[PDB]
Each structure stands twice: as C-alpha cells, then as structure tokens.
Amino acid sequence: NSYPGCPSSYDGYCLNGGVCMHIESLDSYTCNCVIGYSGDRCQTRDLRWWELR
C-alpha cells in the first residue's frame, strides 16, 4: 500500500514538490508529482499555481 519510503537520497531529485515513496516493489523510489504539474517530475510546471509556502 502507498507508504513513504526512499533511501537517504531522494532528498531533492525532483525540483518541484514531491512526495517520496517506495511503492510495493523490490525497489522503486520516487516523489509523487503535484497538483498543477506533471511529466517526468512536474518539470512541466504550470508555474506558480497552488501552494506558495
């Protein structure tokens, strides 16, 4: 089940926000994109539109 989890890294692999997880798998470690942007890692950022702080 979806649950936070990522090696010491994943501390800034994604520019935009990002919710670190491990996904039910022998590996897989990433940060879920956000509301307003997506792609490889929300790189396709629809600019300031949502959360400022």
Domain that holds residue 34: 1-53
Buried b (16+ CB within 10 A) or exposed e, 7-27: eeebeeebebbbebbbeeeee
Residue 37's CATH number: 2.10.25.10
**Approach to solving:** NMR
Residue type, 44: T
Distance CA 23, CA 53 (A): 27
Residue found by looking up tokens 């307003």 in the block: 36
Task: Please tell me the total count of domains within the chain.
Answer: 1
> Does residue 18 contact residue 31 with C-beta atoms inside 8 Å?
yes
